[PDB]
Symmetry: D2
Subunit: 363 residues, 4 copies
């Protein structure tokens, strides 16, 4: 499986080792993918969905707070756990992404998993509560979303599968049944390394791309969507962005970094559709500390000066754009069975390359 850079698309700077969000130290990604092409008993439509889990500091025996910031570009979607991100500045545990009507079971399963996995924290006499970050995009065109196919066991499998190294893209995890710009969408990831004050830090992005319309699609500045008009879902009948970094940032700086994903999604053409739940979260793995109930009264934290941040912002925007394009390149056709209303095609690599060549952007 070539990724976008392999096809000659003219991407943007130096990446971490795997060109993925796992290039940020300690962050692991796990997936559970459900691809069925016949309905379950009592249903009329097949289940194509899944769960994505991103866990920071995956080696720690205790949950480690990660400072974080959210940006709600267009709130037509769900992302739980953000009230204490906004006021307390951090979250604990994994980011879990699934389909819109699997939020509940994913939230329930994640709390249960945290109580088991971090038993020495939560199965004690301390009064602690868990508020996980669970988010979604809507796969009802290709998935039997009102059949609630994702179970507790499916979400635990994603959490138990978290790992470092290369990350699968395309039709996997929460991205399985997604559609972006009229083509097959799904999971995408990328990373960038930047130098800041004599040290090297990584910015990694993971997206669940389910947004945009064909006409808007722009790849490398070329209006590809004006040239590749066939097979759109419309003719036959949301985006979650997670940014991770090891740069030492505080909450107020991370809310600014998350806001940069607005430009990041704009790069491939969308003006931000009304029905698109476009919600971005950014977290840092720097400044490790105990949970509130075990911390000393004063904490010493490192924080970056703001002056040099333009290169970090550029890296974040570029990583989001490459993560979206990687999802489209990695995706495969889906649908077209007797139980489907549509056939969603993955963007054709040779036709893409040809259009970019005509506009002098095929590297």
């Amino acid at each position: 499986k070539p990724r976008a850079r392999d096809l000659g698309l003219p991407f943007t700077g130096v990446t971490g080792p795997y060109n993925a969000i796992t290039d940020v130290d300690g962050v692991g990604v796990g997936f559970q993918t459900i691809i069925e092409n016949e309905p379950r008993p009592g249903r009329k439509r097949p289940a194509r969905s899944g769960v994505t889990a991103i866990l920071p500091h995956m080696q720690s025996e205790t949950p480690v707070p990660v400072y974080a910031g959210v940006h709600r570009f267009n709130g037509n979607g769900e992302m739980t756990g953000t009230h204490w991100i906004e006021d307390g500045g951090y979250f604990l545990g994994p980011v879990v992404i699934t389909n819109t009507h699997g939020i509940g079971m994913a939230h329930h399963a994640t709390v249960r998993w945290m109580v088991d996995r971090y038993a020495s924290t939560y199965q004690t006499d301390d009064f602690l509560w868990i508020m996980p970050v669970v988010a979604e995009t809507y796969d009802g065109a290709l998935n039997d979303i009102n059949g609630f196919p994702v179970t507790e066991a499916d979400v635990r499998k994603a959490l138990d599968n978290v790992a470092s190294g290369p990350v699968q893209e395309g039709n996997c995890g929460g991205g399985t049944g997604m559609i972006t710009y009229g083509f097959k969408g799904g999971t995408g990831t990328a990373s960038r390394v930047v130098e800041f004050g004599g040290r090297s830090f990584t910015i990694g992005a993971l997206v669940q791309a389910n947004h945009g319309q064909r006409d808007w699609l722009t790849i490398a500045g070329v209006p590809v969507g004006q040239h590749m008009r066939d097979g759109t879902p419309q003719s036959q009948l949301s985006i979650i962005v997670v940014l991770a970094t090891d740069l030492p940032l505080m909450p107020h700086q991370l809310k600014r970094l998350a806001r940069r994903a607005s430009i990041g999604i704009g790069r491939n053409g969308t003006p931000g559709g009304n029905n698109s739940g476009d919600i971005f979260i950014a977290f840092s793995t720097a400044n490790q500390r105990p949970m509130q109930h075990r911390s000393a009264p004063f904490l010493d934290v490192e924080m970056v000066n703001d002056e040099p941040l333009d290169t970090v912002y550029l890296a974040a925007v570029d990583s989001v754009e490459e993560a979206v394009v990687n999802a489209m390149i990695a995706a495969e056709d889906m649908g077209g069975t007797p139980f489907d209303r549509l056939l969603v095609q993955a963007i054709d690599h040779e036709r893409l390359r040809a259009v970019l060549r005509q506009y002098g952007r095929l590297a």
Copy 2:
């Protein structure tokens, strides 16, 4: 059961009917209450929890958008469904309140119930998604919160039990296991009728009171907590506010109304604790309209002028204070079994009356 006014407490203005949130026409409240005093098999602590459901336009055959506004006073808690309240301006379906780790099952159950109840809307070819408003307070001192006692059936029972009329208070629904100001807490409700542009409207409040410390408790402006010092949970070892009105208000005005609940909770003494998840939602039942996919492109709406709103703001504040006190008066002692760490007592009515009398505030 006498309520606060029945004991001579010096409350504030004219109430609707039932002096409850059901005084706002069409708003129904349902409860599922779980009170056990012996552990379930494999658990060590008893289950004392439940679910509260508040459903606007409870007669409608289709979900009716209700404009709304949220105020996160201190975000150490969860309230789902707020991203589209912020950007879209409204929510659909019920407000469901339970315990912290019951969010996920309550969310899952609510989406499933909505798909069944509003089958003519959701079991169609339309691409529609549901993002319910599910909130919580933490009952881990009296409840086996990591045993996940609330099931899907429990939440469906609360939803199917919604009704107009008098509302049960104290140890019921989501407030079953809650503690407030070191005394037994739980569910409380109150309402006010106001005249605006001649016209008569109601403001009703429902609270799940689990906040505050004994030392802070102020009732009718009297420092009761300084006089009633025994039995605190501390010596032995959050608040969700929902405001409903039929006044015709738009989202930006409803956000201000919800922010008035900050002063409302301040009335009984709290300075707003760090660990308290204090999140308030206000919604109007005016301006009924179809869902987005069935609406005409232009809607005609009525909105109040802002000049005469002080009387509405005062009624909101007063109703929140009365609802909190009503919860304490309705509450009953809980705990003290061989499986408990604490015995939480309900505030004693005669002792309270005596303290108020000493400061000239017993009416």
Copy 3:
């Protein structure tokens, strides 16, 4: 001049030495007070107004960033400089408070004063811009506000007069012509010392009180406004809160602290009027650092754990309530001339004491 504690009002905890915002080391307060009782040439109404200036790190030869947070409880007023407080986390220079239509001249004068006072910073080749924090309340009932009485020289005088030590209250600075709860209002201040993690800190408040209606007035929990009904402004025909602390807080924590001023203003009875511009700013004097253009790329900062903050929140609430009541106790009758529409009286001390005594609250 007795302050509220001197009259036997039952205030709250241990104050710093001056019981004022200048108890926070290095914070200076300066005033310019204009009290005229005949109209200036071409005007019909007299000028009663002024400027209040609060300067953190008043010894420093260069401007020192102070982390800060704002809460807009009801935005019917102006407070400039908040965009970079929200995103950047801090502000530089003084907080300047005046009347509503004097914002512009105060802003202009403050920039000019900073360019002259910090000449080694601003009269260089560096590209630097200044965005001062200038706020207001509306003194149109007692002041010729459309006569623009405050000049550049008036604001420079306040800035040049900043000093530590005891702070004047009542009819002075920006508070000169203000009215609160139908009585004469104005400037008030108070402070609290708290122990946090084996260290001592101070929380100081300064308020410009111009809010509330007589009927709502509550002092020490007693409904004083129901007993002292005469001479209201109505019968004859906003609040800025600044909190300063030396506790090491980051911006996300300071926004929470500023939000606690909502309860602080609720303590004296207001439900938060529609026309009241109720805007609060909290800043810390800890974590001194250079300006952005002179900072190293990485900074080391100290930050408190959030667990023990309840005593800090309680001190902040109590300090706001005391600063408001101090403002009413220090104020003097104003108006009643042939050019006035009103005569605004200060609350009478003996009548106040008598009402408190009847409810058992006169210490």
Copy 4:
């Protein structure tokens, strides 16, 4: 003067008659431009600055509230008047744009101008206050910003000059001394006409472009900044966006519209620089009503459904992009005198055409 479309750039959709913000009926624009090439007495650098004024409902004898919404993308700049836009939902009077240190005099001059212009509203016995919307970008590289060249008379001249019709672009009004993408910047405008529900509406934008670095510049998706590398300000040694529409939108909807300008400024390449004060305001001219003190208690308003808004969001993004490019095309070289540090050149039209032609984007 050819504008961007006249040079063959491949712009986007149908414009209104002037392709400017004055295509929204009743919106006037007025400018005061100060271009001096020798220092004023006692100064060392020349003054090149000015004022831009945008007045909705310019014919009205009384101020007419216009619902509006703001998006602070990166708050390193000032825009006054936003607290009541956020909570009250509207503003009155003009949007005035100038240089960073001219805020104060522009604010003062606008309040004074409104008192005179709307004398039947403000020179009465009513208690009314004015909180104008005054914004800025920083022209310190080309202008003697610490000389405070803009006077009260300069701002009154811009206000008195508001007019419909064609709008001047480039080195005029507040944009006079601005620099964008290392080329001369300034004022730019554009409009789009869209059909919504059988009715025709216009979206217009006006920008004061002072943002970006040369290397990021992208025009029509082409990386022009990589090809036109000479004369950058760096080698020699912020953006305010105003969107106006006649679509009937409420405040919560206008906040989303103003958020779309983030994608609009990302079209030309910036990732959003840390030092860039990028603040956007959107307002609607629909739903005319009286001021709060003259309104009936209930108002009837028209509001759009959200479903069809994607075409409006696209029009908004495209108009911001065209306005920024129009500002660069209209700009003229500035500086390079014995008193300057730099010579800022306007982008060369022929060179730009040549780079676009090479990538197949010259229409």
